[PDB]
Amino acid sequence: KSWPVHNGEPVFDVDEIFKYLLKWPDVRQLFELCGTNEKIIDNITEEGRQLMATAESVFQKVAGELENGTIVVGQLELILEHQSQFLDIWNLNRRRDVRSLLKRRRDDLLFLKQEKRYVESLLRQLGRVKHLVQVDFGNIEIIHSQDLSNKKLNEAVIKLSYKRETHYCLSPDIREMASKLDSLKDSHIFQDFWQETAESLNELKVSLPEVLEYLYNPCYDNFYTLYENLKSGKITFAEVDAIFKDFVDKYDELKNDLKFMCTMNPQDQKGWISERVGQIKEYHTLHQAVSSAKVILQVRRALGVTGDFSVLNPLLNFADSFEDFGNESPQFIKAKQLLQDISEPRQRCLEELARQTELVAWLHKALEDINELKVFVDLASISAGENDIDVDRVACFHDAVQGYASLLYKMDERTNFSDFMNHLQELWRALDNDQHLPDKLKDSARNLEWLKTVKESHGSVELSSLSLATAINSRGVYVIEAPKDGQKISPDTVLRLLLPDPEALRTYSTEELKELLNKLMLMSGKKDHNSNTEVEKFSEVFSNMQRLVHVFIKLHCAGNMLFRTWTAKVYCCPDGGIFMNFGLELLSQLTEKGDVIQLLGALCRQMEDFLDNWKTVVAQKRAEHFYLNFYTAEQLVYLSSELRKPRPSEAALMMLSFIKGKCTVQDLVQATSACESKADRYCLREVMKKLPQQLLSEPSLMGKLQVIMMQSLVYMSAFLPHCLDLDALGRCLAHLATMGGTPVERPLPKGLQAGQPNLILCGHSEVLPAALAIYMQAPRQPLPTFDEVLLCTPATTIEEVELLLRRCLTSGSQGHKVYSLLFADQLSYEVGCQAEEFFQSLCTRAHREDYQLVILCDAAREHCYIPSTFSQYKVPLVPQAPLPNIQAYLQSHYQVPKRLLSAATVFRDGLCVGIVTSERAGVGKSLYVNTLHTKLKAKLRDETVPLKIIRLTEPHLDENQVLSALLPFLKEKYQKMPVIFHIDISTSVQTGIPIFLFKLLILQYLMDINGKIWRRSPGHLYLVEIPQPLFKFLDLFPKVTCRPPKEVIDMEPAMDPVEFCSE
Amino acid sequence: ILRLESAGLGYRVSAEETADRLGSIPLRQLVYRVHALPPSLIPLVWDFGQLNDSAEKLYIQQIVQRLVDSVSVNPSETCVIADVLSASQMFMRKRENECGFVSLRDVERCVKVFRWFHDHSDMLLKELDKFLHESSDSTHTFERDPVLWSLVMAIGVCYHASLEEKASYRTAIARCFPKPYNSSRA
Amino acid sequence: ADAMQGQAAFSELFRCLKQVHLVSFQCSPHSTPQGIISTFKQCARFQQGKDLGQYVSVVVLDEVGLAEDSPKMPLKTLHPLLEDGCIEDDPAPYKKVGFVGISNWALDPAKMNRGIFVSRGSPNEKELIESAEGICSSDRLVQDKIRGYFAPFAKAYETVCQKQDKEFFGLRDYYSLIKMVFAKAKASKRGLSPQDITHAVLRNFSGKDNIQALSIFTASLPEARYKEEVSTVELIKQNIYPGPQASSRGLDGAESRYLLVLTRNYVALQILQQTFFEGQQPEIIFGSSFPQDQEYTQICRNINRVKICMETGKMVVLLNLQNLYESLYDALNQYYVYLGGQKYVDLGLGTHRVKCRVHTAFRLIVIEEKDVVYKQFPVPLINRLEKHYLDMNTVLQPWQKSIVQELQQWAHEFADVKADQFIARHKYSPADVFIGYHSDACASVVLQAVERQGCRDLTEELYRKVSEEARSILLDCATPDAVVRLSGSSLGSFTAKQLSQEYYYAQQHNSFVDFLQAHLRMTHHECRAVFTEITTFSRLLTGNDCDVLASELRGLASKPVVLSLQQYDTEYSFLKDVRSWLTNPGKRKVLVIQADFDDGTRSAQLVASAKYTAINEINKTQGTKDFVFVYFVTKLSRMGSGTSYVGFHGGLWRSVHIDDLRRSTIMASDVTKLQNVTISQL
């Protein structure tokens, strides 16, 4: 149980076992107890004895290695770490001289490691100046690099004395120079000497024998001469301030460096370091005093006051002159006494005050006294900024003047040295509590522009970042409107914040409110609870208002047709109240005062619960009627709003053409007249009568809102008498569907079952044709549409695929249909997961057990969620019909019949959809379109035919652009006279061509999930260009091609009357 | 391209799975990351002058002569500024590659930097003298021509900084300079 | 930015130049053209109303090399926004604006070629030594007493940067290594120890698994070989806690990067709360999961909290850098603009960057999972932080590993009971018996026990006590019926009797109120905030139990309040509830936070957020004389919901299982007596 388990008895080596024997203090006692008496070794076990034998053999091997030189150095150092245990075990195992052997071994290991340190130091010295001189280090450059796993025996410990190691030193001379570079490795002056001797060479490959002479020897001779000069004390101050310049007021390390100096030559060190280091310190302090006195004379000249010092003139006279001696002379000590122990710092303080004569002059010009500062800081606070730097500007100014008014305001034009020294002493005492005060003075001085524009500041138009929060808290009205203009419905354009005062008004948007929010979570803190309470209240009211906006758009896009005209004016003021309004003539205003935060949160609670119950009831209504399952929530809202009007918009009728086909307003009113009996009117009247009496039953707005939302949920037509509720919507859609005769019947192909979903893997190039092979097994029938065919794309809304699954699995439909989910693999992980959960739930609840659901996928993309979870329901056929069959099917189904008055008459026997292409461009594609246009103009005189031309030029070809370009073209019915569109496409559109072409041409639809629907009309011509994957897919549609003249002059015309007739 | 990929950390996305492709090559590593000219434009493109560098001297000659306002700057040193900038452009061309194919474009900007340095050329030289007097020998304490020093700064901004092989540029550019900075070391 | 202020510049050269105002828009792979367009609009707006010859704004795209291959192609309007500065308008002045496009990856040349690329290359050994010399220019003799290490270090770093395909290491690591050797050498004033170099090299070069970086750097410096062991816990403690002399001289320029802890199963917080947090308890800046909270408001408050912690000097433990990195990248850079001796980092939300103060002692700890950092972290963020690994085994020394294995065996035998009282062979996992057992729990409980002792000296005397205390921990959250059933268990007979005796005499589980009475009397271990979480099978408190608890507690409790997780849709509802609970006078308060895992709500992932928010409030509202007591109560079901319950969490949390919440006068409060007596003898 003490073996070194390493995930279960692996050893395959010997070093780990040796470590285990050496370190464990119980192997020692176990071995000693076993060796004392052999009556214990005879009875242990069969495996314990074998492991003991293995450990014994390992220790025997290492012990045998010890006597000779093959013992590895690492295990040797382990023994040098566990000397005691190894000695005891060796003494025990002697029974089956050592102290002298161990002592000699430790001595020779010390020699080895000291040589190792010496060669390391040599490499350090010769690589420190590597950029100046390059050295080839014999063989040691690679011998020192290898780790110490090499064998010991290479250390050649021989007698007849000298011990040669694997580091092949050229001579004992280089060994000694490396040793002395190790002893002097830690001197700054030695570093400077080495650098200055190395720069005396210059890109020269210089070897060690001439490194010793060219580099080391001059350095050492100069070092010796300097050491002798320092011992004598005959040095001059030019060399001193040249070399010791890097020893300013750091004298303990200087003393230690001089000790390292004196250890180089082995002599005594008693009475030389102290006085010489004191002389260096005195010289440094004299230079510092010279600099400080120069700065004082500068401020006396420049600040403005003449003063009278007349004491440092001899010092200045000495400063401009040069003397060459290294001794101390006594006549200046009494003069220097006054600044014997001033400081090393804080001359930065006086020199920063001195170099800024503009600040002091301006402060004396403007302030003139110390009592005005307290008013002045307050006056500057309002003029300052809002962030941390701007707020702390006034604080650093105030602290700077508080710490500098002693030597700034308490001075006389005639001062005596004693009182000036006392004032300076008090100044240092005051500065000691803020050692960054000179920085504060400089930072305030550099803000002289802001600080001169503070007294003369006029009315500044900048309210605050926090007083503005005060304004929002006092009178801010959060106004939700859901504007009805041409703008969108994003959470940015539905919420506004009106701030009154005069009678001017300012309207913050959510973007500007967010900007201010970022501004005032980062603003300074006054350590005052009022600021942070007020900002917290603003942030929370805005957060609950943002979440109300979130829920409101969630409910609008989920489709409520009752909150379309909802509006709310929250008064954030304490006990201001929240004021709701519905866009109706029968619903009163709902207002309640009190705390805004908690009651707003409760209101959002009821709003979200109403949203949940609304999703539940809309799901039930769709599961019942099955024709609210052709439009998602936004299209349902549009239809409901536009159905009650006497004339529905042409967009609504074109959308409804997907349920009925050739929809008309007369049929729409005929259906909507039979979708409600007088019992419904009586019920709504009863609700209207009972409603106010139950409203008056609750004091708070919570209960009244709850009851009003429950009544809108159950009985909605009473609330909004200009938009159909989901139930009336379903009745209208179902009656229109039943009125539409000849239901379509599409049978599933062979090998695909009409009661279980059919997953097919075909490959990206065959998904579109194979799906077609599913749909032409019932010829002479109209093509499918966005219903029953979902050309799925990356990031498709879960609601659309849920809608497809719903129309697949609801019983009341009047016709069997095949529902193909194409390219199901590019759906997102989450969209696919929710679609799968939705399919499971919807087949759990109820459906018709005859649905023909097919799921076509990319054969190379089985790794995603939907196909991986769909492996069991796979049909291993991959249906496919011959390509000419697809061509003939699409061509004869694109044929616009006669007596239709279409543009397609100009085409080849009326295909109404065509692709003009060429392998190389610049050939006549657009010219062919224009010649078809003029050929159509030749017929149908009084043409006035428009030619819309959408330029699709973007990467990741997008549907909404083409839909928006199409939208204002055929919602009017006056251009139902034959129209020639012209879709034009660029050569940077590689990633959207096939899905878009199949959607527009085959599916005959283009839909905005939150917008109207375009249906390709059977009778209006289309001409989509295409540049030249797509090569095969292009062939399905009826395609007419044009080739350059050199390619059309051998098989064939390729000419046009218009270009030739022009001059 | 190897230097670009070794610009510290490599490209965040590797060239194997990158999306900015023209054909099989990334548009990332092109000197011109210009998208493909669609057909009917390529059969109509045509090369302009390749800037054979014989007229480049006169182009930079004009560019400085206008954009410096040399009414009182120097009458002769427009020639030296013209020729040093043209020699710099010659070197930038004379590498079998150029950092941005920057002919006549770094020139209109380097003369602007030179004009900026010369309009300011009454204080920076002063602080330069103080800096090299407080910590350097008298060797770097010579009178600096406001027209030459500012030129050195313009060339060190627009050309010298954007190079990893600046030594060759310096030795090829100092041969076109007057006495004070006739050496690349200067 | 700090230097070339118009008239507030630091030197006469800079005063004569323009006035800089920068707006920083960090680029990310998921960037938008509208973001850079809005940043340009903001800088142009700042430019408007000023002098075009004296004031300039500058857009700064800090990571423009990340936004080159987004599907939306964000870096497209950058090329025009530098020549005319606006779109769909007549070109005009005040629209042109300065720009600095910093990047950590190579750029696309052409559309950015109007500017001049400073394509700074990987420095050679010459520039590495030169940068080392420049970094050590601050002092001089301690500069040259570490000069010898300059040549090898760089070389070693080179080999590291050569030996790995992924750029887990960069020049930040080398620079900060030089800085740490600086700081320790100038503090020592005597030289440099092998422990010093080994600590610096390991602390800076760490995190990655397939690198023996210490061995590589000791190959170039064989003299700097360390034979003693080095652990990660001390490395963390000396990253966070600095030295008394450090950061006490004129200005502070030597400091470590903001720390990262790499862990799996999100366990770092446990040990970090248990052993490291001493004296002052940090604030956890995390992604609150209260339902339908707004992410933008949450991160805004998070950044406000971290900024307050900078201004005060209190450590922050972030749990989120996928959304708090665009707002904290410049603060992680750890470069300050001094103003009166005070450090001001850049803090920004979106496009609004301002200089916020930072205290002398403010440490930032990121906590992240190994997989997500190794495949989703941007890479410069790795170099920006000081990677470390303390997951479960760095702090679990091998004898504690033996303890966790022994405890798992003893738990499996505690659960392994065969009894013939009832005719039923129902096998019990330790999940069923110990409520909240999830096969990683024994390591957690042994961690808790050793932290409860804290002596951590192996002199044959502490191992027994840690074993007993961990056993007490595992028993303290066990269902009472199995405690009675212990008789037929593999643990024998005497173990059952002693365990039940401790379970009813030393441990008080008869009543919640009795638990309070037994706890509040005794003095704690110098701890000024203590909280305990409770698991129950009985019904949660209704509202009439608080009154009876207060009546029985006229001198020990302080009129408690009870909150339910079902009613709390926001952080702030919880905030105001705990604030009203803390603002009232009186000491030894009591709060109960209720959450029922057996219901139709999603109130199961809100427990962590609720606990974190409560701890944050306790640490930001407590004075120095009031004591606090929080009792989170969760009710589980005996029908199998006591097995799915992830159990003993760490820190200032001690899971106890109380089967009966309120009281029961009918039954005696000792089931062992009912075991002794039969129905007839009753």
Ligand SMILES: Nc1ncnc2c1ncn2[C@@H]1O[C@H](COP(=O)(O)OP(=O)(O)OP(=O)(O)O)[C@@H](O)[C@H]1O
């Ligand atoms: N058969 C033709 N006879 C005379 N001119 C022709 C003929 N075909 C093309 N052209 C000329 O080609 C010119 C440009 O070609 P065109 O407009 O057809 O390009 P395209 O096919 O749309 O090109 P791209 O694919 O680049 O958009 C036109 O000015 C037109 O006059």
Ligand SMILES: Nc1ncnc2c1ncn2[C@@H]1O[C@H](COP(=O)(O)OP(=O)(O)O)[C@@H](O)[C@H]1O
């Ligand atoms: N005929 C010419 N004479 C002199 N200079 C010219 C002439 N044509 C062009 N240039 C120079 O070309 C430069 C254009 O700079 P650059 O940006 O490189 O080219 P472009 O503006 O075409 O991108 C101008 O500075 C201008 O001095």
Ligand SMILES: [Mg+2]
């Ligand atoms: Mg075309």
